[PDB]
Amino acid sequence: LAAKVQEYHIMSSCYQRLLQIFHGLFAWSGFSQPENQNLLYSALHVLSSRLKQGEHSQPLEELLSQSVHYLQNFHQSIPSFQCALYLIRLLMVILEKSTASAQNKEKIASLARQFLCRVWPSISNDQLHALLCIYLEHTESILKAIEEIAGVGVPELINSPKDASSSTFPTLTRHTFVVFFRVMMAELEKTVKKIEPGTAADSQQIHEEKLLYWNMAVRDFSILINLIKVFDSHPVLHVCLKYGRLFVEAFLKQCMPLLDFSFRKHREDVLSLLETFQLDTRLLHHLCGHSKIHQDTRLTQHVPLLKKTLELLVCRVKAMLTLNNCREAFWLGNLKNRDLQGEEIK
Amino acid sequence: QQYVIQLTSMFKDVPLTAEEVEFVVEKALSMFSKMNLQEIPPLVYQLLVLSSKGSRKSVLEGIIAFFSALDKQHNEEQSGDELLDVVTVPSGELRHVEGTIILHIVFAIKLDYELGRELVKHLKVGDSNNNLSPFSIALLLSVTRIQRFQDQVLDLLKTSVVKSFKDLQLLQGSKFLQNLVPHRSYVSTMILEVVKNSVHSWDHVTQGLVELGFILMDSYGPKKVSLSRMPNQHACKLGANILLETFKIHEMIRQEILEQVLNRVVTRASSPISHFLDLLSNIVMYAPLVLQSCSSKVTEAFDYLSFLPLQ
Amino acid sequence: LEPSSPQFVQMLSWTSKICKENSREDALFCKSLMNLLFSLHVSYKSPVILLRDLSQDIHGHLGDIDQDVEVEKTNHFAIVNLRTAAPTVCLLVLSQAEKVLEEVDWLITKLKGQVPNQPVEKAIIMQLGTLLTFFHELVQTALPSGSCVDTLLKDLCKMYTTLTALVRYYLQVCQSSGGIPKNMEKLVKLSGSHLTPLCYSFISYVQNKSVATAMARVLRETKPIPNLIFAIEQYEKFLIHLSKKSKVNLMQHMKLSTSRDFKIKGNILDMV
Amino acid sequence: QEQLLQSTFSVHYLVLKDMCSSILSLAQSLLHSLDQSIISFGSLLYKYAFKFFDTYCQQEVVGALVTHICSGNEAEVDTALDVLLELVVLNPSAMMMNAVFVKGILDYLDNISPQQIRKLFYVLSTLAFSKQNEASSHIQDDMHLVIRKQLSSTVFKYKLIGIIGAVTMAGIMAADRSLSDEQCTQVTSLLQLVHSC
Known part of the structure; x- marks a missing residue:
């Protein structure tokens, strides 16, 4: 059908149901035990035969990958979005059989981007969250993908006829932007959390690499909060005001010691890092004040803990300064409260 | 006011919703005073065997509140000159119907644990927990015969008495707070009255009572080997009072109390055992x-006397 | 002595008469005497007036934090001398205030679990309105940077937690839509215009002017100011809840919360 | 593991039988958990305790299992019923004389879900149809009357219980083994009776 709708709407549901059956069959706990490993091998052989048969006896890796290449061919034409998510899930459960995952975690992510960039003519928020969570984790250099999505989100808001949200990501609208924001910030928090510094025993290259990684992380975090100025609605504001607290807690907990260790060797980088984070925390304070200017219980519910773990950072910066015998260098001062757009309220 | 016993047949087979059964149990609560004292236990049996498939909190709450109020009224208006005086139903009838009803409730709880879990969660304590009463304390003490609820009710009783003694020690320590509030019956005298009231020929609470006494003594003994010591000393005093009180009244249990006290006091561990020694001296006065x-446990305690150190 | 007799009253009068008369250099003697006075006076009425008119005298001797305020010292108690007030009396009066807050919070939780709630509310409001003058009086003192300022921050956090418990109880009560009388309104407005901004002005002065166990001690320092900020913000949030419930507004009286951002200097080059 | 407890109950059963009441109390206490490993361990503890100990402790075991079944909680009911099934298929003769206690459960048929009633009738039937009982087959001819008096009732719920029990007992009575005798005629008579009722 590259070049009456009852049959099309029936076969679409059949196509979705079929891959649902496949995913249900290929993802049960019995395959963990080695009793039915022969049954699993026979099923994989049945799958892989339709490419090129002739060798019943084969290594597991070879026919596993051949079956995967067979199933990947169905991305040529599928009619819905649920079908695409199910195909991705089935590929996900099949590929984890192989021990090595050097290339699989990249091919899955590339296919997921190929599905997400497809226009999908007519989609619901409960499924796009899962698909974008699959895409966002599997790419290497998560911060690069996050920053790229943030830098291609602006072709929407800069020039869009009303509801004609055709960006270079054709599934970025004014009704589904909050899902993108939520998964983006959640994945940023998750990938930040798992970093760990230790004992400063490594060479200068390791420390400079970690500082560079953190500099990229905080730059992207600033560019991800900064565009809530133009998108000020209840759910996006709520999700940013929650996961910003989460990220600040992660930054204080995990990479304050790494800030402690290398103050001697690299003092010019860390100070600029703190100023760059200070700008973002200033805007977060502006958000915290704006949340209570207009009384709204559901959004104000989170501001006490945010204020606590955002004064914690200032006091811990003072603690870091005192740890290296430099107490006299600390100097405080209040700040002028601003609105979200930036003014001087009185 | 005569066919209420057969008024329960309407809620047996047909399904109902919560509002109408709540209304009829409210009517039953309002007519508890009307019907009779003696007719209550069969009605309680009928409602409680109905309650498995329907309302379960309401009936238990109503029974507990009614009997707490009746006990409170009888106790308040019982005091007076030993002469002709106004009184409601006498003690010999009231304690007997309370015993029959508590035994029936324990049996019904044994038939389904959900009623017992609802009862335990209902009487959860910090807070005053004003629903505590001699009847409710007796109930909680008699449920301990089931293995599912033993620790879950003993720890609640222990924290309750600790909270009460903390309240007393806080209230006696100031004038302003003492000036504002009127005193309420603190749960120490509540249990100390339940043990005395237990003379009326029911023994299904003695085991819970002695177990509570021993737990409450062990958990708050003087471990010296300053503010929190005063509740921790009043609790031990209450435990000794409770144990000595159940020693005299009930006969079947007095063989094991002395055995436990001896078995806990004759040791080489050199742990502080002053309170157990005081209790033993008090209960060998008789x-x-x-x-x-029990004239045997003392004998083999004597036979072991050669091994212990000098002190 | 039984706490109702002419002898008890004359004994308390005699101890108060000494505490209003003489001056002694020793810190132990005055601390024992103050403990004696509070032990007598705590069982004859609430000491909440004594704390106010004692800390008002404490505030005179040390000085304000603004560096340009002419206090009057009011000479209430002669035994609270210059060398007496700094490490000894302030810590003790803070402990006594913590005891008073414990009593008030027990009253509040008892009365909330109760549901005669007409006069008890007035009494609690009276005590809070009295000791809030105490806290407002000794916030601006230039206390020594030892443990006394940390104790003050801990007790102030306790005060705020108690007051939010009271506001929560009024949330639980005002479901009748008319349970906000004037005695609460004065308390809330006065708490807005006396204590809350001065907390921030004090925190500015506290922060500004100054092996593994060293690291543990350093991390031990960082708790009280964030704890206080969290308590204050929780208070304002529950106040917003109460304003949304019964259609009145209370955030008119108290201003917008100021916010803090650390700075730095290029004076670490002096270190090397 | 479980061969550890197997050796425990195999070698030192004579000394361990002194405090078997405490053993049963411990098993009863730990059967009230939520996972499956602890519950299975307590189940096999009951089983092994019944296997080696004295007849009085066997009576105590079956009493504890009966009160477990009538307690009410679903996991306890299923576990205790499975324990009884494997216990009666393990040592039918010792369990045979204690049929009174297990039959006494049948008075409480409002605390048990409909599905577990079939399992209860199954375990009771396979208890009452071992050929060791043919010397004095009383449980079988008692249950043929219990089922009749259940089916001839007027309450609908007991009629449903009666049809469930009659079918699941006729199944065991006409079980295919390694017969074609008068027992088959009795099976036929029971089926036409329960069809007419």
Whole structure:
């Protein structure tokens, strides 16, 4: 059908149901035990035969990958979005059989981007969250993908006829932007959390690499909060005001010691890092004040803990300064409260 | 006011919703005073065997509140000159119907644990927990005969008495707070009255009572080997009072109390055992009473006396 | 002595008469005497007036934090001398205030679990309105940077937690839509215009002017100011809840919360 | 593991039988958990305790299992019923004389879900149809009357219980083994009776 709708709407549901059956069959706990490993091998052989048969006896890796290449061919034409998510899930459960995952975690992510960039003519928020969570984790250099999505989100808001949200990501609208924001910030928090510094025993290259990684992380975090100025609605504001607290807690907990260790060797980088984070925390304070200017219980519910773990950072910066015998260098001062757009309220 | 016993047949087979059963149990609560004292236990049996498939909190709450109020009224208006005076139903009838009803409730709880879990969660304590009463304390003490609820009710009783003694120690320590509030019956005298009231020929609470006494003594003994010591000392005093009180009244249990006290006091561990020693000296004051029941445990305690150190 | 007799009253009068008369250099003697006075006076009425008119005298001797305020010292108690007030009396009066807050919070939780709630509310409001003058009086003192300022921050956090418990109880009560009388309104407005901004002005002065166990001690320092900020913000949030419930507004009286951002200097080059 | 407890109950059963009441109390206490490993361990503890100990402790075991079944909680009911099934298929003769206690459960048929009633009738039937009982087959001819008096009732719920029990007992009575005798005629008579009722 590259070049009456009852049959099309029936076969679409059949196509979705079929891959649902496949995913249900290929993802049960019995395959963990080695009793039915022969049954699993026979099923994989049945799958892989339709490419090129002739060798019943084969290594597991070879026919596993051949079956995967067979199933990947169905991305040529599928009619819905649920079908695409199910195909991705089935590929996900099949590929984890192989021990090595050097290339699989990249091919899955590339296919997921190929599905997400497809226009999908007519989609619901409960499924796009899962698909974008699959895409966002599997790419290497998560911060690069996050920053790229943030830098291609602006072709929407800069020039869009009303509801004609055709960006270079054709599934970025004014009704589904909050899902993108939520998964983006959640994945940023998750990938930040798992970093760990230790004992400063490594060479200068390791420390400079970690500082560079953190500099990229905080730059992207600033560019991800900064565009809530133009998108000020209840759910996006709520999700940013929650996961910003989460990220600040992660930054204080995990990479304050790494800030402690290398103050001697690299003092010019860390100070600029703190100023760059200070700008973002200033805007977060502006958000915290704006949340209570207009009384709204559901959004104000989170501001006490945010204020606590955002004064914690200032006091811990003072603690870091005192740890290296430099107490006299600390100097405080209040700040002028601003609105979200930036003014001087009185 | 005569066909209420057969008024329960309407809620047996047909399904109902919560509002109408709540209304009829409210009517039953309002007519508890009207019907009779003696007719209550069969009605309680009928409603409680109905309650498995329907309302379960309401009936238990109503029974507990009614009997707490009746006990409170009888206790308040019972005091007076030993002469002709106004009184409601006498003690010999009231304690007996309370015993039958508590035994029936324990049996019904044994038939389905959900009622017992609802009862335990209902009487959860910090807070005053004003629903505590001699009847409710007796209930909680008699549920301990089931293995599912033993620790879950003993720890609640322990924290309750600790909270009460903390309240007393806080209230006696100031004038302003003492000036504002009127005193409420603190749960120490509540249990100390339940043990005395237990003379009326029911024994299904003695085991819970002695177990509570021993737990409450062990958990708050003087471990010296300053503010929190005063509740921790009043609790031990209450435990000793409770144990000595159940020693005299009930006969079947006095063989095991002395055995436990001896088995806990004759040790080489050199742990502080002053309170157990004081209790043992207090309960061997009634020398013939020990000789009637348990004259053997002291003998093998004597046979072991050669091994212990000098102190 | 039984706490109702002419002898008890004359004994308390005699101890108060000494505490209003003489001056002694020793810190132990005055601390024992103050403990004696509070032990007598705590069982004859609430000491909440004594704390106010004692800390008002404490505030005179040390000085304000603004560096340009002419206090009057009011000479209430002669035994609270210059060398007496700094490490000894302030810590003790803070402990006594913590005891008073414990009593008030027990009253509040008892009365909330109760549901005669007409006069008890007035009494609690009276005590809070009295000791809030105490806290407002000794916030601006230039206390020594030892443990006394940390104790003050801990007790102030306790005060705020108690007051939010009271506001929560009024949330639980005002479901009748008319349970906000004037005695609460004065308390809330006065708490807005006396204590809350001065907390921030004090925190500015506290922060500004100054092996593994060293690291543990350093991390031990960082708790009280964030704890206080969290308590204050929780208070304002529950106040917003109460304003949304019964259609009145209370955030008119108290201003917008100021916010803090650390700075730095290029004076670490002096270190090397 | 479980061969550890197997050796425990195999070698030192004579000394361990002194405090078997405490053993049963411990098993009863730990059967009230939520996972499956602890519950299975307590189940096999009951089983092994019944296997080696004295007849009085066997009576105590079956009493504890009966009160477990009538307690009410679903996991306890299923576990205790499975324990009884494997216990009666393990040592039918010792369990045979204690049929009174297990039959006494049948008075409480409002605390048990409909599905577990079939399992209860199954375990009771396979208890009452071992050929060791043919010397004095009383449980079988008692249950043929219990089922009749259940089916001839007027309450609908007991009629449903009766049809469930009659079918699941006729199944065991006409079980295919390694017969074609008068027992088959009795099976036929029971089926036409329960069809007419």
